[PDB]
Design a protein around this ligand. Structure first.
Ligand code: HEC
Ligand code: HEC
Ligand code: HEC
Ligand code: HEC
Ligand code: HEC
Ligand code: HEC
Ligand code: HEC
Ligand code: HEC
Ligand code: HEC
Ligand code: HEC
Ligand code: HEC
Ligand code: HEC
Ligand code: HEC
Ligand code: HEC
Ligand SMILES: *[C@H]1O[C@H](CO)[C@@H](O)[C@H](O[C@@H]2O[C@H](CO)[C@@H](O)[C@@H](O)[C@H]2NC(C)=O)[C@H]1NC(C)=O
Ligand SMILES: [Zn+2]
Ligand SMILES: [Zn+2]
Ligand SMILES: [Zn+2]
Length: 516
């Protein structure tokens, strides 16, 4: 839980460790040192305004010997000189005070600091306001590429994108015999140094301590503008994603014979706002990443090396990831408390046969070849998406029983369960109705009903739970309980997912104790 926890293992690049791991606590220290009216330079070399976030050095020593001695030295040097103030400061033979063993860096578990589109926009405005320039001139402040034939780092206008396309978890080989620093290292050097030097210049700034970037609670407090500006890199507003062979033009030669279940009209513009960043989809790869169209060179009907042989279908369909359409949507439906009551118990391993047609369009040609340029795809799509721009439907309340008393099950111990059926259906619907994804993929008004009344044709008079769950045991499938289990698992299961009362232990909340 400790986002300020740093696991110092700098010296394992030399091979197996001799000792249990160190775990330095950045806040204990920053708190202590800010008391002593001592700033960051107490532990970090400042070179022309810019701090290094290496501990008490600018270079890493080249033997284990030297590194470990430099650590010990600089660590215990300050301890020695604050013995008066902090007599409890670990001393040297006190191996376990520093080598405490296994650790978790809190920040590795908490959610990532990122510049989402709204926050990114604030940085563009602030940087522009600082350099007293028009927004398009701000980018050079932060975005760069290495020029081999110029020996330095330059701003490549029109090549901006996520830092992670070069700054990765395991750093890439530089050109060059050095590394491109990791995401973690590039981010700290970059983000915090700028935040520090703007707090110094006493302008409005961002966080410099661990808790400010790495706890959900600080993240939640970050200011958002009322409007998010468009971050425009040549993306379409809508495009048609179609089976066939696509050249870098965006041109696809399509054989309509080969193309079923049908082209997908994708709302790119809506997604930038639904997702709130670009990299979640235009993901970093082992070697790089780009804002490139997924399907041109990387994800093909067959599967190319450039996309690790992940096919078009797979890149759209794969479960268990947020990079694909179905993967992201089902990730959300199962994570959100308002969706998870119906979605968590659904099977997690197959794509639903009901879902195909909510993405794949009908009524395109079923044979013939056609060349579709980029602009014709994007035009057709925008027209398909607006023409569905549909009032979604729910079941008239008069068709939804109001309240039910359930008395299916002597040697009993409980009265009949009272069950506020219409009010629950209303709450579930009113919350799903906030989600354009729910409203689209629900389709029919009867669908939501199926979250409880499942495994049968949708109906306004669905069968009784007993009709399937009171069947003899040898007739039920393995995950098809008897009737008490059906009710308990579905009722209580949803209450536990959605965090609603009565809780599983609040027996009497559903059924009052019996009068024997
Ligand atoms: C008690 C006298 C010991 C012993 C036997 C060791 N240490 Fe330390 N140690 C500290 C820090 C910040 C590092 C760098 C960590 C890293 O980069 O991996 C180390 C590292 C070591 C090593 C080399 C790594 C290894 O386990 O092989 C060794 C051999 C080692 N230590 C032994 C910090 C501290 C302290 C904080 C003030 C204290 C006290 C100690 N170490 C004490 C000891
Ligand atoms: C000048 C108007 C620009 C343009 C055209 C872009 N940027 Fe930035 N940017 C910065 C950082 C740290 C990131 C990554 C943040 C993260 O991954 O959490 C980005 C990201 C982008 C993207 C991709 C956005 C995405 O969500 O994938 C793009 C297309 C982009 N940038 C273009 C840092 C900065 C700045 C420092 C405060 C400045 C100024 C800019 N970027 C400016 C621009
Ligand atoms: C954040 C503001 C962005 C930006 C700057 C871009 N995207 Fe996307 N995008 C997605 C998909 C599936 C496509 C492919 C459609 C196809 O194969 O043609 C694209 C396409 C692009 C482009 C290229 C357009 C071209 O003609 O080559 C560009 C420059 C682009 N995008 C930028 C998918 C997504 C997302 C999935 C939910 C979201 C989020 C983003 N993109 C966000 C952004
Ligand atoms: C356009 C916005 C997309 C979409 C929707 C996907 N990709 Fe890629 N992909 C590439 C590589 C090299 C891999 C293997 C792992 C890696 O190197 O990161 C993948 C993997 C995927 C997945 C599977 C899970 C995952 O996120 O890793 C999915 C669902 C997926 N992709 C979808 C390569 C590339 C690119 C390199 C030229 C391009 C561009 C894209 N992919 C674009 C997209
Ligand atoms: C809290 C830990 C408990 C305990 C000990 C029991 N329940 Fe429930 N229960 C619920 C429903 C819809 C039924 C079918 C009702 C009926 O037709 O009588 C039941 C049934 C039972 C039984 C068997 C019936 C009997 O009268 O003995 C038993 C032993 C039982 N329950 C124990 C629904 C709920 C809840 C709805 C959200 C929750 C909470 C509970 N039950 C909690 C408990
Ligand atoms: C590839 C086109 C890159 C992108 C996108 C980003 N960076 Fe970068 N970065 C890249 C290289 C090749 C290097 C130098 C590697 C070396 O051999 O030294 C860097 C360096 C940095 C640094 C360190 C500067 C130093 O004194 O060493 C920082 C702080 C940094 N990069 C940050 C950064 C940010 C914030 C980016 C997105 C906004 C970003 N980089 C993108 C290559 C590429
Ligand atoms: C200048 C070169 C910056 C770099 C690079 C990064 N940040 Fe920044 N940050 C900067 C400024 C001038 C401001 C204030 C914006 C304004 O209103 O004028 C900020 C603000 C933030 C905040 C907001 C804090 C809040 O609103 O409560 C955050 C969370 C933030 N900055 C984070 C951040 C991250 C994560 C960065 C790298 C990925 C980053 N900043 C880079 C200046 C600069
Ligand atoms: C997250 C990383 C997503 C990916 C990748 C894709 N979708 Fe998505 N979609 C997502 C959200 C969060 C939303 C609505 C906001 C909400 O909270 O409900 C949507 C919505 C849709 C919709 C319905 C609205 C519309 O665009 O018409 C559709 C049809 C949809 N998404 C389709 C779609 C396709 C075809 C995708 C991949 C090529 C895709 N989505 C990816 C979240 C994310
Ligand atoms: C019970 C009242 C439900 C609530 C709450 C939500 N969903 Fe739902 N969803 C429900 C059913 C019965 C189905 C049909 C599933 C089937 O197997 O046919 C769905 C379907 C979806 C889908 C499509 C799933 C897929 O196969 O790709 C999505 C993307 C979806 N639902 C999203 C979703 C969201 C985001 C919700 C909270 C805002 C939500 N659903 C609630 C039943 C119920
Ligand atoms: C779970 C939260 C439910 C959703 C959403 C809907 N229904 Fe339901 N319903 C549920 C239970 C546990 C029961 C009792 C079933 C039993 O075996 O006794 C019902 C009952 C009905 C009934 C029967 C009413 C009667 O008097 O016998 C009807 C006609 C019915 N439900 C319709 C219905 C519709 C139309 C729904 C969506 C609009 C719907 N239910 C949602 C659980 C849940
Ligand atoms: C999600 C798919 C649900 C399932 C299955 C069941 N319930 Fe539940 N329940 C759900 C919600 C979202 C709420 C709050 C509705 C509101 O706005 O108030 C409830 C509430 C109840 C209550 C308390 C009603 C109230 O005090 O307002 C009871 C007693 C209750 N639910 C019982 C119950 C039974 C007996 C179920 C199986 C027959 C059952 N619930 C299923 C969501 C879900
Ligand atoms: C001054 C510039 C210091 C440097 C450099 C290092 N430490 Fe420190 N340390 C310092 C103070 C003022 C304190 C007292 C804080 C307190 O809560 O009493 C400490 C304490 C520690 C501790 C003990 C924590 C506790 O008992 O709660 C440890 C384990 C520790 N320091 C380790 C440590 C390491 C590994 C350092 C170099 C990476 C290091 N310290 C440097 C002041 C200073
Ligand atoms: O995805 C699958 C496959 C097996 C199957 C079930 C399973 C359940 C479960 C297990 C979890 C799940 O949904 O997969 C539960 C908890 C369950 C409960 C249940 C309730 C509370 C019902 C009435 C509101 C209900 C009705 C019911 C009907 C009428 C069924 C047949 C027409 C039926 C079948 C069924 C199968 C084949 N069930 Fe159910 N159920 N059930 N049910 O579900
Ligand atoms: C008591 C010494 C000390 C003080 C003072 C100090 N730090 Fe550090 N900081 C460290 C140590 C140790 C590391 C781990 C780096 C290493 O092993 O070289 C670190 C790392 C960091 C990191 C990177 C963390 C990581 O895991 O990548 C950031 C960011 C940072 N410090 C910022 C600051 C800021 C801002 C201040 C001013 C409040 C500050 N530090 C003051 C000791 C200190
Ligand atoms: C771009 O994509 C393909 C590269 O593989 C080109 O062969 C493709 O064909 C062109 O289509 C144009 C439509 O405007 C024609 O003007 C014509 O130049 C043709 N080129 C040929 C047959 O060699 C290119 N399309 C576009 C829109 O640029
Ligand atoms: Zn266009
Ligand atoms: Zn009973
Ligand atoms: Zn729709």
């Amino acid at each position: 839980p400790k986002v300020d926890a740093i696991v110092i293992d700098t010296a394992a690049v030399f091979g197996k460790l001799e000792q249990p791991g160190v775990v330095f606590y950045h806040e204990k220290h920053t708190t202590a040192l800010e008391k002593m009216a001592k700033d960051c330079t107490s532990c970090h070399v400042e070179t022309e305004g810019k701090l290094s976030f290496k501990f008490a050095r600018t270079v890493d020593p080249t033997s284990k010997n030297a590194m470990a001695e430099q650590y010990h030295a600089n660590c215990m040097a300050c301890h020695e000189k604050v013995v008066g103030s902090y007599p409890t400061a670990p001393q040297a033979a006190e191996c376990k005070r520093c080598h405490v063993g296994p650790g978790v860096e809190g920040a590795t578990v908490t959610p990532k600091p990122s510049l989402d589109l709204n926050l990114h926009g604030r940085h563009v405005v602030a940087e522009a306001k600082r350099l007293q320039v028009k927004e398009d001139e701000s980018c050079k402040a932060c975005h760069h590429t290495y020029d081999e034939a110029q020996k330095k780092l330059v701003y490549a206008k029109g090549e901006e994108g996520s830092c992670v396309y070069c700054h990765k978890q395991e750093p890439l080989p530089s050109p060059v015999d050095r590394v491109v620093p990791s995401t973690r290292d590039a981010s700290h050097e970059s983000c915090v140094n700028c935040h520090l030097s703007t707090r110094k210049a006493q302008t409005e700034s961002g966080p410099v301590l661990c808790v400010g970037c790495h706890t959900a609670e600080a993240q939640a407090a970050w200011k958002k503008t009322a409007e998010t500006p468009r971050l425009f890199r040549g993306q379409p507003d809508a495009t048609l994603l179609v089976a066939g062979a696509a050249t870098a033009n965006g041109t696809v030669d399509v054989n309509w014979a080969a193309a079923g279940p049908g082209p997908v009209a994708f709302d790119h513009k809506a997604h930038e706002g639904f997702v709130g960043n670009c990299v979640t989809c235009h993901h970093p790869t082992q070697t790089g990443g780009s804002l490139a169209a997924c399907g041109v060179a990387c994800h093909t009907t067959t599967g190319s090396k450039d996309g690790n042989f992940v096919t078009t279908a797979q890149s759209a369909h794969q479960l268990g990831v947020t990079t694909s359409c179905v993967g992201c949507h089902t990730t959300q439906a199962n994570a959100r408390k308002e969706c998870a009551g119906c979605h968590a118990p659904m099977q997690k391993t197959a794509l639903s046969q009901n879902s195909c047609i909510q993405c794949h369009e009908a009524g395109f040609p079923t044979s013939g070849t056609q060349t579709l340029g980029k602009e014709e795809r994007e035009a057709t799509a925008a027209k398909i998406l607006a023409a569905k721009d549909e009032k979604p439907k729910t079941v008239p309340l008069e068709n939804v029983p109001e309240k039910l008393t359930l008395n299916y099950m002597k040697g009993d111990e409980w009265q009949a369960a009272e069950f506020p059926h219409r009010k629950i259906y209303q709450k579930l619907v009113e919350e799903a109705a906030k989600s354009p994804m729910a409203n689209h993929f629900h389709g029919d008004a009867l669908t939501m009903c199926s979250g409880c009344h499942h495994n049968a044709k949708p109906s306004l008079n669905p069968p009784k739970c007993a009709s399937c769950h009171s069947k003899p045991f040898q007739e039920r499938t393995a995950n098809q309980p008897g009737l008490k289990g059906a009710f308990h698992n579905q009722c209580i299961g949803c209450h536990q997912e959605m965090q609603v009362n009565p809780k599983a232990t609040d027996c009497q909340g559903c059924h009052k104790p019996k009068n024997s």
